[PDB]
Write a protein that binds this ligand. Sequence first.
Ligand SMILES: Nc1ncnc2c1ncn2[C@@H]1O[C@H](COP(=O)(O)OP(=O)(O)OP(O)(O)=S)[C@@H](O)[C@H]1O
Ligand SMILES: Nc1ncnc2c1ncn2[C@@H]1O[C@H](COP(=O)(O)OP(=O)(O)OP(O)(O)=S)[C@@H](O)[C@H]1O
Ligand SMILES: Nc1ncnc2c1ncn2[C@@H]1O[C@H](COP(=O)(O)OP(=O)(O)OP(O)(O)=S)[C@@H](O)[C@H]1O
Ligand SMILES: Nc1ncnc2c1ncn2[C@@H]1O[C@H](COP(=O)(O)OP(=O)(O)OP(O)(O)=S)[C@@H](O)[C@H]1O
Ligand SMILES: Nc1ncnc2c1ncn2[C@@H]1O[C@H](COP(=O)(O)OP(=O)(O)O)[C@@H](O)[C@H]1O
Ligand SMILES: [Mg+2]
Ligand SMILES: [Mg+2]
Ligand SMILES: [Mg+2]
Ligand SMILES: [Mg+2]
Lengths: 317, 99, 330, 341, 405, 325
Amino acid sequence: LQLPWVEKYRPQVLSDIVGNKETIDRLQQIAKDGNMPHMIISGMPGIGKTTSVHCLAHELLGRSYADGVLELNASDDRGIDVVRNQIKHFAQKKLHLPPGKHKIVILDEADSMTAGAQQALRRTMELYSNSTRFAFACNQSNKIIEPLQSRCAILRYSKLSDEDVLKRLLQIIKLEDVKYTNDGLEAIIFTAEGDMRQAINNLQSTVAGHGLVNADNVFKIVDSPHPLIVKKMLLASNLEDSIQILRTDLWKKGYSSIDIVTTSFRVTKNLAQVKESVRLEMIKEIGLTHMRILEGVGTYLQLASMLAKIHKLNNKA
Amino acid sequence: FSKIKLPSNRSILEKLQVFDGDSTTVIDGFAVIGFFDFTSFDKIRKSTKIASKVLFRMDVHGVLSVNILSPGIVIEVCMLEKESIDEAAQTEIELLMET
Amino acid sequence: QQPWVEKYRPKNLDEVTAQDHAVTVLKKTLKSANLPHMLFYGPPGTGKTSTILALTKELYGPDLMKSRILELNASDERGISIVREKVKNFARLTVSKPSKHDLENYPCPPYKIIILDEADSMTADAQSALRRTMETYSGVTRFCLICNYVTRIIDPLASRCSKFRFKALDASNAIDRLRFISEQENVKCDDGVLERILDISAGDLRRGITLLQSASKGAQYLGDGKNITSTQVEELAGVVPHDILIEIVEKVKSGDFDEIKKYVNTFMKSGWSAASVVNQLHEYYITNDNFDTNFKNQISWLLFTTDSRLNNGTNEHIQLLNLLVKISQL
Amino acid sequence: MSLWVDKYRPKSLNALSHNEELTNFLKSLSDQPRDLPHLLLYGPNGTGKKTRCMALLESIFGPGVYRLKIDVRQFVTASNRKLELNVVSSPYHLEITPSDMGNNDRIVIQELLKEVAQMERYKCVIINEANSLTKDAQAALRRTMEKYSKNIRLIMVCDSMSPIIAPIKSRCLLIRCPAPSDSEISTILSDVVTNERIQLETKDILKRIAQASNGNLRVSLLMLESMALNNELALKSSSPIIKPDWIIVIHKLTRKIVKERSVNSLIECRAVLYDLLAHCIPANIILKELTFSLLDVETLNTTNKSSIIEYSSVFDERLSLGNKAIFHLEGFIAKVMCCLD
Amino acid sequence: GEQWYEKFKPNCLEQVAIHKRKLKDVQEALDAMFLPNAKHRILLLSGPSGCSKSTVIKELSKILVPKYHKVTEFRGQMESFSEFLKGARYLVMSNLSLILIEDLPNVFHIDTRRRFQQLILQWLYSSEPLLPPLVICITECEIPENKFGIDYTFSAETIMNKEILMHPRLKRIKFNPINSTLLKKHLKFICVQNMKMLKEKNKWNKRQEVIDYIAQETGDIRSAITTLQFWATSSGSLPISTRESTISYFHAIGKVIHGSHSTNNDNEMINNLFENSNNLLSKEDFKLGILENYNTFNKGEFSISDASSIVDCLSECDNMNGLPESNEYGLREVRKTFRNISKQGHNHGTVYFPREWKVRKLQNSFKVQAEDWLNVSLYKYNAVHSFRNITLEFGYYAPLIRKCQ
Amino acid sequence: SKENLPWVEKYRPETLDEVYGQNEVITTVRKFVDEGKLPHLLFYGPPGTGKTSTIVALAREIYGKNYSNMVLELNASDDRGIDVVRNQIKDFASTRQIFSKGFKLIILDEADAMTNAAQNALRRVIERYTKNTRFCVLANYAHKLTPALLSRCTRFRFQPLPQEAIERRIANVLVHEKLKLSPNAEKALIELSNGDMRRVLNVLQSCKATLDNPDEDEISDDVIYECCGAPRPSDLKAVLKSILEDDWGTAHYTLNKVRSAKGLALIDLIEGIVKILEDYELQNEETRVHLLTKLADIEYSISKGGNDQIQGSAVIGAIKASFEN
DNA sequence: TAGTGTCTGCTTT
DNA sequence: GCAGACACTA
Ligand SMILES: Nc1ncnc2c1ncn2[C@@H]1O[C@H](COP(=O)(O)OP(=O)(O)OP(O)(O)=S)[C@@H](O)[C@H]1O
Ligand SMILES: Nc1ncnc2c1ncn2[C@@H]1O[C@H](COP(=O)(O)OP(=O)(O)OP(O)(O)=S)[C@@H](O)[C@H]1O
Ligand SMILES: Nc1ncnc2c1ncn2[C@@H]1O[C@H](COP(=O)(O)OP(=O)(O)OP(O)(O)=S)[C@@H](O)[C@H]1O
Ligand SMILES: Nc1ncnc2c1ncn2[C@@H]1O[C@H](COP(=O)(O)OP(=O)(O)OP(O)(O)=S)[C@@H](O)[C@H]1O
Ligand SMILES: Nc1ncnc2c1ncn2[C@@H]1O[C@H](COP(=O)(O)OP(=O)(O)O)[C@@H](O)[C@H]1O
Ligand SMILES: [Mg+2]
Ligand SMILES: [Mg+2]
Ligand SMILES: [Mg+2]
Ligand SMILES: [Mg+2]
């Protein structure tokens, strides 16, 4: 019974966590001093937010982790009354902690929690701010209401760079004693596109299916991300080359047309080297194609016509 | 913490022996911990409303078979234990039990 | 006492005509039990419902409909929860033990048929539930999918169900059936009346049957022993006379906007649907050889655009006026 | 008893004046009521298709068809929320209206038609404004009138046949009701003013009313009542042609658009459109009459008229495929001012 | 340790970050309330989150109660709040305790909000001698994505159904975000209180730009205090993240029409507006706002072609069944054309809400009038004409025919 | 009993060796299960590629007789509300295995049709209850899935099955059923397959039912085209040649004759026309744009409904106008 | 004394 | 982002 590489090597201390060096160092000073304020952590999923919160709580508590934490997650009875009662009962107890230490309550995935529960949470924090503390884990801070964000410190998380992910990959490779190649690691980074969990899963698939980590094996087990192919084909000059690229990539690898349309919409929204008028015309054409596909006409001919219209408005005859 | 205790009186504890995984070697001084969800006990509460004798039997795998006797009919129910105890709770269960 | 549409509905698989592949497959499946899921699609009034009803009648028998065959349609509520529970239940009901009379009177197969009429009016979640249910209960339960439009049906349903395309009933496809119906009902027609009726209703035998019934009723009411002509059925159907179409073409050819506008106003006062007018104008323009290729291409595109606009449910006056103005300015 | 439409309503096939061929067609259909197929009536508004349906029902059944009864019942569409339909009842037949919302209309028709069908000497129901459907109740109709074609006969009356899907037109007989010519409307007006013993200085006033109404019997009768009551039952040749305030507002907006082409003119036109739509008036007919009012201006040339009619068709398609109503009218008017100069 | 915003809680009235005009207005309103002749039965104080709402009442009741505890805050259900209100009704003499309704009970359900409304109506119209003072504090913040009022924007107008607000015995005083000058002064006060810890680290020489950025970035005093505490506690080289605020309904239209001064490029501004405020820009009756407000770019003095293109594009967007791509395309087109025509822009017109509810009310009035006309006509004799033909023929001819006869 | 089921369900694979085409995925998952390591596999691909069949074969291979009480199969046919999902999967994963010393596999067919909150609860359970319980995600659409789910689950892509897999499955079916097909019929079936096995099995069953005797005969391309209704390549070539050569009269006559003699549909005809037109070269860069736009509008109109003759004439006119540039 | 900063709009169903 | 009117000391 062997745990997967994602979960077998979960960091237990803040030193093992890589990525935002300044934020990790700040968390280390918070753990050492003990002054724990209310925090909200948001960013790209799977970059080490919940893991960082757990490591900070462990380093702050030690032997008090048995009772000093109330980890209420999304997969729970997250109502308005039972949650309020549970948090009130948790906040109306005292334990033998040093004066510089406080109880920590972790609420992972607070975005999906109901707004009435958010108001109850605000009432609990206002009533029992002196004893317990709250640490939030989420992907974006938009879903958290403004008054709750007012009573906390927001620490935005950025995407992990090449250096941190590569360093973590090297440590895990040294721990597992697995032969690797620099080109294979570069391919793993390119396919991950800044994701740590995805990189670990891809490395595990490469070592299980083929052994040695090579770029060819990584490309064989998993294809390149579709946003990159969408961006490559959208900025193509000639219509024939873009048509051939979209066909030979998306239809040969088996990509759904609605997924292609959604990815193209996201790429056009995030595109930079394009004029505003061209961008809005392409957005309108994407919306028309999306409506056509959603109604039921999602053949390759619709995608080809969409590319033809995009190239026609790009060239302007 | 809620503790309901069944005493050693033979009126309600006529037979109780702890085995060592061989079903023949009875031992004394060994503790068995069973982590069961509230749902199964709530479902079984109605089944035990009218009965004469209730038999409890679980193995090292954690699955629990409860026999209900009420000649009368026989009702046997099989249960499932949780995957793992919460952290290291079982220690504090005994530490409160001889407390 | 019964309209000819319902009175002459084919109750047997040999009564339907102009359908070779589907009828042969069903007939050969009558002696076996390897019946796949059928996706019935085609033009409206082609005979998919009649075909599935005949297959169900010849498969089990009148007694097994009450306890073995259940159909879905738009007549009742078809919400996601209701459809899910109903379809899962009826795909979980056991195969009813047949009586002896069914056994030595009909070749009863060991499965059951679930009929999904007008399946194009179903949501994506309902279709996903249906396809998952029919995969997980493919043992002794079968699903029949009937829809006018294939595109509205999701791709997995089209992949899992066998595609049985229903060819449109042209003049030569249903001329024999119309002749048999006329002979059975004692209807007298001239040489080229049934063909004209079939040409009026392109791939639609129900419309032709209704037109024939109306013509027969008119002939019976008139009293004299006369034969029905093409003019009578054309005017009952709603076909614009050729003289008025020629006048419309002449008005369009002339470069006067006021004359075209007043002619369109009078035509709308006549209350004639512009779809038939568009079809007749298209037939006249493509059939005529007095026009060049470029003008024919442009007018075909304009008529296609006007038909697409009319199919959405717009004001017929504005669409026909715009089409005539665009044609006159070509 | 206080209107021309109700007092002098024909109640028989022989009582009908215009469309003798249509009367013969209805007589032929009523010759064998048992073999009557499903009917679909399409034609101009105000022609009298409802009158033909009532005459056919009276011929098939007899007395008591024109006697109507009122009953009310509620249909549940979501939770405890229910919407009531003002269904009108009658012996030997029945009539309904699609006054409900576009989404609950389908289930209301489903429940009502399932209740009416039952088992059974059939019952005939008239479907007023069958064209005003969201392509959802039409599936229920095409299923029920095919499966339950033993005791129910749906009768469909509508002004436009294009919104009706092809299967419904296939299963239902196409009945044509052309609007009467000027002579027939003039004869009807002469008869009804003879029966009302009102003064008539000349016969040209009836012709003017017929031309103004544009082949609409209801509009002609209401205009005749207006001129009779305003002039104390003494018609005059110099009496002005009375028109409804809606057409007057449309014409005034057309003149304002032709005269002034600016942004303030655009916002006042938007305000007028909002006020007009506040009167429960559909936007499609508003755009249609605005187009006809813009097209009759002699100042505009052929190119401007062609551009206006093209934009009108495009925005009619947009309104048909859209949800809101103000946007398409506003775009049509703005495009008209853009292409005018 | 203890939080700065709790340790540095104000003691005197001058410490509260409140405007002089706002302080005078709330003082006058309260003083009017405490007289035996009560002009306003309840006091409603809306506003954004963390604009020093509750503290104003707290220190005001601290300074005024001995003149003639401090407050009675209701903990956050239905019958409990009914009992709390009834008990507050019987606290008038020898105590003079103000009744605070901060952190109001759950209103996201229909039943509890309705019973709250009837409780408010019952207490507002109670003809009982004397009156216990009562203050209601409501935080204006929209609920993110998870109808008809709640779940779109949580504010005073959402909870109260235009009846409590339109009452003589109420004084609605909306609160503004904390001023930049007041925020800077309070941050400087915190710094001169924490001089020792400030001199402990190398943060005193790099203080002015941080204080200015914190004051100009957010209008919440509590969030600013928390950010200052986090920055001071941190060793250094750590970027500061603030409490991201919200954009109002009219603010979104103003940003779409004119643009944004902070971000000159339109693409990034549009992307940020879509990401942060997807609910506002994807919910209905917002394209109507653009269609009614685009005329005020130059008081209706721009080209007719741009307006025609705008409305045509809006029609195409409406044709896409309200897809997010349609909204993005429409907003981008409007922003692009206004940026193009902004070469000559001055004296922009004021904006307004689109007149959509009035049209619906008039349509409902027309419907009920038509129903009454059908009822009376059917009672008089037999007359059915469906509903479509009424507005075209019977909506005008029948009224004048009946009037003349 | 067998031999009374549709060929789609009759030929359902039961072992990993019975899954053709995706050799790399099969080898990778075999290597994963040989080491006792199941890293929350996620399967993505077009329908008919063999996702649920592959997971069923894998569960049979690694468990055997434990499928009845260890594998929890959830799908669109079962209610998957937020409360239902959290309760059911929490109860299943939190409970320890009965006697087998192996990971617990949960199969979630059609995972794209769940709410966002249900997906969040599922992704929390995946990371929380993972000591003994693993998860399988099956979905043809990735835009309806939370991006967090795609990170914790290893994504495997199911490519359309190549010609070799289709040919091998056809040979196996012919061995099982004692049937013969011409090489031209095999090529036509390869062309019509479009990377789908269910369609191939369905049309093979339909063609076998079409034959008057299953034995002592050979299946040609003509019977396949007649039963499936697909137009012949020669018919499409003749129609295209008539369009490109005959101006408007005899071209329309030829199109009507082609559509009337065999009753071909317009959608398949235009699909074939554009399929051959894709092979042709166009050194103008503008004719192709007009062709694609006009053809897409034609398909949209046909989906919305209309007149077949008018649509066909529109196709002819659009092709002629585009080729006149 | 004219700029800079800053309150108030502008929302009802 | 806009305007209309007021705050506040140079
Ligand atoms: N900086 C890191 N260094 C090493 N491993 C990491 C790092 N970040 C993430 N991981 C790995 O990724 C796994 C998932 O991390 P999580 O904290 O659960 O992701 P997340 O940031 O909370 O985002 P979610 O869970 O999708 S909302 C961890 O258990 C680690 O194995
Ligand atoms: N092959 C056929 N031979 C004889 N009559 C036929 C045939 N196909 C259809 N009909 C006639 O068509 C009428 C109705 O047939 P249906 O089966 O309801 O058509 P349809 O395929 O169901 O069209 P829908 O339901 O609108 S898609 C009846 O009068 C049948 O007799
Ligand atoms: N100088 C200050 N002026 C005002 N408040 C201050 C000051 N210094 C610290 N604070 C704190 O800032 C907070 C302001 O309280 P309020 O905004 O009135 O409460 P509130 O209205 O409930 O805020 P929300 O909207 O619920 S987050 C209190 O916690 C004060 O203790
Ligand atoms: N690799 C394969 N080799 C042979 N037959 C296959 C293969 N993959 C799929 N099939 C056939 O396809 C049938 C249905 O495939 P399924 O796996 O049940 O559906 P699916 O491919 O998962 O598509 P969906 O829409 O996601 S259920 C099986 O019963 C097999 O007969
Ligand atoms: N043949 C006819 N002779 C005389 N009047 C007629 C005739 N047909 C219709 N009408 C007139 O039409 C009016 C009713 O029209 P209506 O049925 O409402 O038209 P629609 O069916 O288009 O709504 C009646 O007042 C009646 O006087
Ligand atoms: Mg996490
Ligand atoms: Mg049918
Ligand atoms: Mg407060
Ligand atoms: Mg599957």
